[PDB]
Design a protein around this ligand. Structure first.
Ligand SMILES: *[C@@H]1O[C@H](CO)[C@@H](O[C@@H]2O[C@H](CO)[C@@H](O)[C@H](O)[C@H]2NC(C)=O)[C@H](O)[C@H]1NC(C)=O
Ligand SMILES: *[C@@H]1O[C@H](CO)[C@@H](O[C@@H]2O[C@H](CO)[C@@H](O)[C@H](O)[C@H]2NC(C)=O)[C@H](O)[C@H]1NC(C)=O
Ligand SMILES: *[C@@H]1O[C@H](CO)[C@@H](O[C@@H]2O[C@H](CO)[C@@H](O)[C@H](O)[C@H]2NC(C)=O)[C@H](O)[C@H]1NC(C)=O
Ligand SMILES: *[C@@H]1O[C@H](CO)[C@@H](O[C@@H]2O[C@H](CO)[C@@H](O)[C@H](O)[C@H]2NC(C)=O)[C@H](O)[C@H]1NC(C)=O
Ligand SMILES: [Cl-]
Ligand SMILES: [Cl-]
Lengths: 426, 21, 421
């Protein structure tokens, strides 16, 4: 009769790209698009039960999430779970659901561990994944001939979801899986200054192609200190792994972005070093269905969720939730058409894997492994105006790097400096 | 530490980060 | 009337020191001893429910353990949880129970993580603990004046509960907390031969006082290759982190003997070797407990409890259960009920107790102070035998049978080279 969907996400905290305030309306938009498609779920109406993944402190936890999952399972006997998004919240839930033999859908849980389907069976990831970032990195290195060394620095506390650790974790494992290049890693604490004279030394000694995963303010300071040391485009290059583009402001209409813009006087010195700086983020969908989706998303969140959805890359998470739920519904429908019941997880999942689909985000392809291919844009500054703008794009499925608006990667010497120093490391 | 796939109730932090595979 | 005790341990697999085959009988012995003391739980009767922490594969898992925990919560509304002992099994359970506001008792879960106050509130550890190994190391390091550096090697088989990683983690963080010296660390894979030339190089480059946490066979091979390379008690020293004494055999010591004509070199090598294990309780009550344990397991639990250092875990489970039972009793004497987690737990913390294991002290943090024995070779016979003893609570070291730790150059080798590494 009616297909029950279990949701385990932040129902009250609205700071996460996957909070109910942002996903709820997106899901409503999805259930609505369902009732309007008679070719989807013949003789089935989708119901929805809600559970919070956040604890008393209001942060997503690895205790409330699975606990809420267990409770929704008993009281409602759902066919599918939605979320959670936090890595540590999702991990136990996906683990429970696989035992339960129930499919899990989420645009969060980007951690490498989730990729192991033997443990995370029936977990389909319809949003970004950090392993995929490794694909992009492999791509960049190939295009620019780097078959030796790279240095990754990452910052992160201990009492949080450790987002920058998982990002680097994905890059590290996938890149080494594909290029054999020696990758050096160094973790630091943003707040503690002791690490700064330590980091420079490490940058100066362990790499030339440098990837930094930190807060926008930390990447700034590092680029400033890099200048003083005499490290510039000449020999060094600095990638800021800013996936959700926190360093840039969105919906500028049509505007050259000032990543470092802070107005403290160091702006000229900043821009000098910000020449060796390139910013890696997720790619914003181009298709018109996306823009129209955001308008509906904004209005509906403001109208019934009491929240104001701002503009930004974080919006692809709720867009990916919307798409994922639709992608699941097509599959259930297909399963029914060939005489399979709705509780046939194993089948519904395989109908979803290794498949392409047209959702609000545009072209999305779930791989053989169960994870949506991720597209990334590489920003760079205009040699003449210095304002950062997308100069490169990477297809997740096609795995190809194609230029944008006739731009070419900036190189002081004209060519990329080698992942090897001029003479030797000693 | 990146032996990844250690999510196993990973909260288990620490430091120990060296090896060689 | 009814004090329900929820049990989450391996009910079918008997390879773990905390298996129900080994722990069940010991717990049954504890409940029985309870029934015989009128001074414990006036007017209350302890009941016990069982849930398996192991998955379909038969191994203790991060999924089955917590799931079983919830079943026992809804079906029985327990006052206390017993187990699990596996780290990745106990972590989520201890977390659920902390949320539920229910005390949890275990003799396993030695990981540093479980020691965190706010995260694992109401979790009392009555068995060994890995941070405590750091204490001993700190004490041992101070004693012989190693004021600078130490190298830690560790290997953990990928499909398991990473036993040796947690061990080294505890040592690493505690030593750094107390001595603030330089502790270098290196992980390797046992079966992988590519790592050996790297381990040796690693020893030579970054370590003099070395602690290895591996299988007995792995520790054997490394000592062979160590001497073969011209490394001996002269400037280097090798400690084997063998907590449950797998390389040895209790109750009645040839850890270097394998019978492959490699025992000549072995002994020469095992000259720089010293073995760290848990201290075997030598009090009479312990001995009498083992025999009763053996019989009860064989007769009602269908299993043969071999002698060994692993037996302290079920003995600790036994004492912990008695320790809790008194605290509840004590809570009841002053008006509290059995579901007063905080009250009962706090009565158990920072308290000394007399159990089959003997003197057990629960610290201010909720963990049993752990005693450790340092085995050493005989300059005469060459057989390893306890030469040192560390009192967990006293934190002081005492020699045994007036023995002396072997040092080839008279005084223990410096934890630093002549001109620097
Ligand atoms: C909503 O979630 C955020 C995290 O996304 C919480 O902010 C964190 O709060 C913790 C303590 O709970 C602090 O130690 C962190 O520094 C905070 N992080 C950030 C990004 O500021 C926030 O407290 C939650 N809001 C509520 C009250 O539910
Ligand atoms: C990324 O590359 C893939 C090519 O594999 C594109 O997918 C194809 O798109 C065309 C036109 O939309 C379809 O006719 C094919 O069905 C797709 N092929 C596959 C393998 O699914 C994808 O659209 C590209 N993404 C973008 C928009 O750049
Ligand atoms: C009982 O537990 C042991 C572990 O203590 C299991 O042996 C392990 O099995 C896993 C897979 O289940 C292997 O990958 C490990 O190599 C094994 N470890 C050891 C020590 O051999 C054993 O399978 C369990 N017994 C059963 C079948 O219930
Ligand atoms: C380890 O040292 C501690 C010292 O604190 C011993 O504890 C004392 O034991 C004696 C006799 O058993 C008691 O009279 C004291 O009350 C204990 N002191 C404290 C603070 O509890 C402990 O017994 C020693 N363990 C062994 C057997 O070596
Ligand atoms: Cl979440
Ligand atoms: Cl267990």
């Amino acid at each position: 009769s009616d297909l029950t969907v279990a949701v385990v996400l932040p129902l009250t905290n609205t700071s996460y790209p996957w909070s109910w305030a942002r996903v709820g309306p997106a899901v409503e938009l999805a259930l609505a698009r369902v009732k309007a498609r008679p070719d989807l779920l013949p003789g089935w109406t989708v119901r929805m039960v809600l559970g919070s993944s956040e604890n008393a402190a209001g942060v997503c936890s690895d205790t409330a999430a699975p606990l809420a999952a267990v409770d929704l399972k008993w009281e409602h006997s759902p066919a599918v779970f939605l979320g959670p998004g936090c890595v540590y919240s999702a991990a136990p839930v996906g683990r429970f659901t696989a035992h339960w033999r129930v499919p899990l859908l989420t645009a969060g849980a980007p951690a490498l561990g989730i990729g192991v389907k033997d443990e995370y069976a029936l977990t389909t990831r319809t949003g970004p994944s950090h392993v995929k970032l490794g694909d992009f990195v492999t791509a960049l290195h190939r295009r620019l001939g780097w078959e030796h060394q790279a240095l990754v620095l990452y910052a992160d506390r201990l009492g949080d979801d450790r987002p920058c650790f998982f990002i680097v974790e994905g890059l590290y494992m996938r890149v080494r899986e594909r290029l054999n290049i020696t990758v050096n890693h160094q973790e630091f604490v943003e707040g503690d200054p002791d690490h700064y004279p330590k980091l420079l030394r490490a940058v100066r000694r362990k790499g030339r192609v440098i990837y930094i995963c930190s807060s926008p303010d930390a990447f700034r300071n590092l680029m400033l200190l890099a200048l003083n040391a005499g490290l510039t485009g000449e020999d060094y290059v600095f990638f800021h792994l800013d996936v959700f583009g926190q360093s840039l402001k969105s919906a500028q209409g049509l505007v050259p972005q000032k990543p470092w813009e802070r107005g403290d006087g160091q702006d000229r010195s900043a821009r000098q070093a910000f020449q060796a700086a390139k910013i890696i983020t997720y790619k914003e969908p181009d298709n018109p269905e996306y823009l129209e989706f955001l308008k509906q998303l904004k209005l509906l969140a403001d109208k019934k969720f009491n929240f104001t959805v701002e503009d930004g890359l974080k919006n692809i998470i709720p867009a990916s939730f919307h798409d994922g739920l639709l992608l699941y519904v097509q599959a259930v429908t297909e399963t029914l058409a060939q005489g399979g019941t709705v509780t046939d997880g194993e089948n519904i999942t395989q109908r979803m894997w290794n498949r392409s689909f047209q959702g609000v985000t545009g072209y999305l392809k779930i791989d053989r492994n169960g994870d949506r291919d991720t597209d990334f844009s590489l920003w760079d500054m205009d040699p003449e105006t210095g304002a950062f703008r997308v100069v490169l794009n990477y297809n997740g499925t096609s795995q190809e790097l194609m230029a944008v608006s006739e731009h070419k990667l900036y190189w002081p010497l004209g060519y990329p400096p080698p992942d090897v120093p001029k003479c030797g490391f000693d | 530490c990146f032996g990844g796939r250690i999510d196993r109730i990973g909260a288990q932090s620490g430091l120990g980060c060296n090896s060689f595979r």
